[PDB]
Amino acid sequence: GPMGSNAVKVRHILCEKHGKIMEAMEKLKSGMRFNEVAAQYSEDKARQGGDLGWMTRGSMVGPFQEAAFALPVSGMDKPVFTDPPVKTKFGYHIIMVEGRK
């Protein structure tokens, strides 16, 4: 149905280990731009600054999806990201959303 048309343009930092995602979180809280944190730490989409692009409802792993649709759109000078990190079967994610449908 209608909810299958919902989507987010989403960016993340993924780290298997909790200690490393915590290092990434500290960099965000120091003011580092999200894409630069993703380049330093992410194990997915690092060469894209963490950008996953547009993702439709159903296409994201469950805990990620719930966290992502809960975030308002933000930009990387004024980011709104998940805190605490979100655990999935891939590891720990810090997520921000740059577009919403």
- Euclidean distance between CA atoms 62 and 25, whole angstroms: 22
According to the binding rule CB under 5 A, does residue 6 interact with Na ion? Answer: no
CB of 65 to Na ion, least distance (A): 10
The rounded distance, in Å, linking the Cα atoms of 49 and 5 is 26
Single residue of 4, 18, 40, 59 touching Na ion by CB under 5 A: 18
Least distance (Å) from Na ion to the CB of residue 30?
A: 22
Distance, in Å, from the CA atom of 97 to the CA atom of 99, rounded to the nearest integer, reads 6
97 burial (CB, 10 Å; 0-12 / 13-18 / 19+) is buried
Residue among 37 and 86 whose Cβ is closer to Na ion? 86
CB of 87 to Na ion, least distance (A): 7
> Which residues contact Na ion by CB under 5 A?
17-18, 61, 88-89
